[PDB]
């Protein structure tokens, strides 16, 4: 442990040894019954600082027009239903003045808040897993073959998993127990997640920051994170109960900045 340094470089060294609502814009969701709000990796979504921001152009922050609650589509929960995934910000690419700022700006940095809501009765049973996965590079269905950009994510459409495996020639491997990444689906509880147990929970609220290796990135060729809703316990009821149990996703961008103003994309 003499700890002397012969060379001049650092890389030449040795090893180192109820009523709780959210009012975003002109929009209000309601409620959490004083339950819980999962926030990211413990980090609230903030703006860009000056140690960051390699760009020299001045940022565009609308703060009201783009940062309100955008209600996505509604999907149908069945007994033989495997799961769904939405890839962001592709799912918000056409909604309001948020998707309009994306076309005129080269870079873009934003955080989100995800509110997955699915109500039932006391006589329904089931359990969902709502998980937000950053950088989910998915595997193709037919290996050694490239696959299409409209099979990964359409514009705001909920791409769904499958109970069996997928033999498609141009899409991703949608086996739900491999979760599209070749990984065990029980181990997706590292990412910011929350369960929806139909006997006690009724909702899930995740607040994700901007997680990327660069401070600002183009949002038309890079999926920042995907949102996977996978039921682990399947929906079961009596045949006299209400059979249509829908799942609505409501998502809202938080602290959105843009840079590089030019004409409309995205060629």
């Amino acid at each position: 442990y003499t700890n002397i340094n012969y060379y001049k470089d650092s890389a030449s060294n040795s090893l180192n040894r109820r009523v709780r609502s959210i009012t975003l814009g002109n929009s209000t969701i309601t409620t959490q019954e004083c339950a819980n709000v999962v926030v990211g990796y413990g980090v609230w979504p903030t703006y860009l600082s000056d140690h960051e921001a390699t760009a020299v152009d001045q940022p565009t922050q609308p703060d009201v027009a783009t940062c309100r609650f955008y209600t996505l589509e509604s999907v149908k929960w069945e007994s033989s239903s495997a799961g769904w995934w939405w890839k962001f910000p592709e799912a918000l690419s056409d909604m309001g003045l948020f998707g309009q700022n994306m076309q005129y700006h080269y870079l873009g940095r934003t955080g989100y808040t995800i509110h997955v809501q699915c109500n039932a009765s006391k006589f329904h049973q089931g359990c969902l897993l709502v998980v937000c996965v950053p950088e989910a590079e998915m595997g193709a269905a037919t290996t050694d073959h490239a696959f299409n950009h409209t099979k990964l994510s359409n514009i705001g459409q909920a791409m769904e998993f499958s109970a069996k495996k997928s033999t498609d020639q141009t899409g991703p491997q949608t086996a739900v127990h491999n979760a599209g990444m070749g990984v065990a689906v029980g181990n997706l509880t590292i990412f910011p997640h929350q369960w929806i147990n139909l006997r006690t929970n009724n909702s899930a609220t995740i607040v994700m920051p901007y997680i990327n290796s660069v401070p600002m990135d183009n949002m038309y060729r890079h999926y920042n994170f995907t949102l996977m809703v996978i039921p682990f316990a399947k929906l079961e009821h009596s045949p006299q109960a209400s059979t249509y149990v829908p799942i609505t996703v409501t998502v809202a961008p938080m602290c959105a900045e843009y840079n590089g103003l030019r004409l409309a994309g995205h060629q």
Binding site: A11, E135, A136, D144, V183, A184, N187, S213, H222, Y223
Partner: protein, 233 residues
Amino acid sequence: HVINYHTRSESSIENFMGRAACVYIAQYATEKVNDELDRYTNWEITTRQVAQLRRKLEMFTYMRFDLEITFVITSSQRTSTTYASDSPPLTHQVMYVPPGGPIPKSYEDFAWQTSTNPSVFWTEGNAPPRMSIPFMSVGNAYCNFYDGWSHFSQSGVYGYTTLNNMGHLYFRHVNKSTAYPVNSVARVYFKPKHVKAWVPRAPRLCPYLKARNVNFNVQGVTESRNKITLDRS
């Protein structure tokens, strides 16, 4: 109570990552028999050829490690009729080509007599030639997983392979000719030091198939057993 003990020193990031892991086994010769096992081989630098180190890195999404590169270069004599020949010691050259530079188009090109590309000369018999490179990137972390495209039109190339421009590595024999052909083998040993790893990732279940994408086959989540409830008195 009991008072306690057992510090988590070996569960650290640097103690888990810092081990000289082989990443590529380069093969070249002196007399060209065919391609491959031609003289003058090369290898673009990627850490996703050997499944042992690849799974270690792919439990984190972003890495910021420095490196320590070591070569274990041994040579065998090729099969022929006779073998009796006195020979001088073999000198080996390992040239590193940065991204964009000029490549040797063949053997005896003047790219091996350049002035900028660093090269390591080494005769057979001594200690292995060890060198270090810093954090070569243009972003601020090594993206192990990049979920996106290369072109703005969402086309061209899907995967992490767009963010991988670490360069190349060119191997040759310095000596002009031997009396009888000798096939050499160079093994590249990466050792990640000064590691910062940011976003943890769930570990890979099914084994890899290709060195450029995360394509996989469907596998069950675990091995099976006979019955759910075990029983004996």
